[PDB]
Amino acid sequence: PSQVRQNYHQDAEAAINRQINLELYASYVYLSMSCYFDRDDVALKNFAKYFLHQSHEEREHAEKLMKLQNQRGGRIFLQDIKKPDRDDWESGLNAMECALHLEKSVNQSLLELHKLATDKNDPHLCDFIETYYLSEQVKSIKELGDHVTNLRKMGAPEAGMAEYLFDKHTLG
Amino acid sequence: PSQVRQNYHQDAEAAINRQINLELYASYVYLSMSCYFDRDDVALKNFAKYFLHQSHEEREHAEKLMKLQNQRGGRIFLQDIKKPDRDDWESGLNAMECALHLEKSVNQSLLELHKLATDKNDPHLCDFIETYYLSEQVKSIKELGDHVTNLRKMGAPEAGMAEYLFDKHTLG
Amino acid sequence: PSQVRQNYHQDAEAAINRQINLELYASYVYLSMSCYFDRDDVALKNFAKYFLHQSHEEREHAEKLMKLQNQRGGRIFLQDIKKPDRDDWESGLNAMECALHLEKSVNQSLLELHKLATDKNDPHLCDFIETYYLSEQVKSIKELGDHVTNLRKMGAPEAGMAEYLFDKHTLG
Amino acid sequence: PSQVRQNYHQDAEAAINRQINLELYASYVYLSMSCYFDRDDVALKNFAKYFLHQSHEEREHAEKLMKLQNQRGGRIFLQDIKKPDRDDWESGLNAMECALHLEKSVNQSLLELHKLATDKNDPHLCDFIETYYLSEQVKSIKELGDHVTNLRKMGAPEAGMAEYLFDKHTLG
Ligand SMILES: [Fe+3]
């Protein structure tokens, strides 16, 4: 195969391609969320900024996996990026809950990739995932859980001032 | 006894050892509180920061008493640091009320130590307690009482925005 | 369980709580050592400074494990912090030997925690331990072994100038 | 009496005059020690510097008591400053032991003055002594005890390198 390839299983290559698609999908979901909060009938600018940042971060995760694939002598095969499950995200609280669910699903995929790398005795790939993916995901999940907790306590979405003040104080 | 020891009663030495343990216990209680507010289902970062600061301050108080004990030629005897009375502190308001109670109990211990030093005609120890402990405790107690008053007025813990906004404005 | 919890075994949670207690215990042992060297009949200020630094570092290790526990959605349960095995540490050499023994016991606990995380297929926890605990412990153990070697060669504790000059040159 | 005098007992005035003389005597003892270490057959420049500093500090203590006496409307009555008990201080260790004894005797005098001020219900004088005299004395006594401990451990005065190296490392 590639002149650089060493200790890199075909299964791992395939799993990395899958993960690239999942990170691109996550970026697209975040972009959809960001847009929602930019609507004139929603109008929460710091929610919009928060989710646009997350969109840009997930793209960066995807690009770093592409760099890995080429560094190890695998070949990138792209697939369609599916549209998000919804256009209307209903509320700041609902979007944060949906983001938490998404981040946990991405984490689960990364844990399955680490298990595969461990099985195939690929320590460079195991180390890569941990170093750049697993601690970031744990941090993200904890931050989103904290946001959900705060919004729920404040009375969102029925208490009208809750998302407004959360947008100002936590996300601003 | 020690070559430096002068006008330092065995009772006072024993009472200082007790006070060291109480300050270490207080530090541990504050650490427990700090952690509680860091939970994903509580998620009040400025409450967590406030109590972690208090934990570090109480350790410093303990270390300053250790320095005193050696300066006067007493001998430090450490004891177990008991675990705090609870793991779940329930709410920002409840933690502030528990902190107020703790600070008053530490103050009471310091007043008993001052009375002992006065009885044993130990002016250096009397002056030390006042200079570094008694005004700090009065300031701490007043600050915690002010926090409790504000949280109660705002409607905590039942009014969901109260602890959130107090965390932002008073503790942030 | 917690909304953030994912791939985090109850065994691992329990083992982290145990490790928190061990790091707090180590901090307390170091504090005891620090105090000893501050006595008027011992009077080795740089030994005192060295062990006080180690005390503060072990507390920081404990606080970082608390942060991990909450990040993963576990719950911190604190226990009593037992008093150190002795009040009188006898000599600079004996304290360094006792510190070496303590650091090796903490390392052994961390290796058992890593083995548990490996068994439960928890790569985030495995990576955390290594990244922040295992290399620090190896460095600490090597430094303490070097100190013990030097003090022994110099003739401590029977050669009276040995601890004095080591305090000045190595620890100063 | 003086137009400024208020709540200032004749006993206290007399005791302050005595304390002035004792601080001037202590300054003179330190000056004698300083000179000794400047002899060509002793030649320990940092011991000489240390005791000259102490001499200048004790003079400053005396001058501050003179300022107090006039601030309270007492009248300063000076007495002869007796010569020190010896001209030859024998060794660095012996001079430090003699200094420790002197500092403890000055502390004892200050504690007797505080007891008198307490008896005569003179809180300004009690506070003055503590604020500027009692903590300084405790610090001085602890420092001298530490020096004596270190010199003894190092083998002074029989181990010829002990005072030389202490002069370099501790006092330099
Ligand atoms: Fe506001």
Residue numbers in the entry:
A (entry chain B), B (entry chain A), C (entry chain K), D (entry chain O): 5 to 176
Which sentences from the paper describe this structure?
Single particle apoferritin cryo-EM data were collected at 15, 30, and 60 detected eps (corresponding to 16, 34, and 78 input eps, respectively) to characterize the performance of the camera at different dose rates. Greater than 850 micrographs were collected at each condition resulting in 183,110 particles for the 15 detected eps data, 251,816 for 30 eps, and 203,117 particles for 60 eps. These were processed identically in Relion and resulted in reconstructions at 1.68 Å, 1.68 Å, and 1.87 Å respectively. The ice-optimized map had clear evidence of the Zn2+ atom, similar to other high resolution cryo-EM apoferritin reconstructions, whereas it was absent in the earlier 15 detected eps map. The two samples were vitrified from the same apoferritin preparation, and the only difference between the two is that one was plasma cleaned for 20 s with 4 s blotting while the other was plasma cleaned for 50 s with 1 s blotting. In the absence of the ion, one of the liganded waters moves 0.5 Å away from the Zn2+ binding site, and the other liganded water is no longer present in the binding site. Finally, the imidazole ring His61 rotates 22° away from the Zn2+ binding site suggesting an induced fit mechanism for the ion binding. The only other appreciable difference in the two datasets is that the one without Zn2+ also had an apparent water ring in the FFTs while the one with Zn2+ ions had no evidence of the water ring.
The Apollo (Direct Electron LP, San Diego, CA USA) is a new high-performance direct detector that addresses these challenges by using a novel event-based MAPS detector custom designed for ultra-fast electron counting. We characterized the physical performance of the camera by measuring the noise power spectrum (NPS), modulation transfer function (MTF), and detective quantum efficiency (DQE). Finally high-resolution apoferritin and aldolase datasets were collected and reconstructed to 1.66 Å and 2.24 Å respectively.
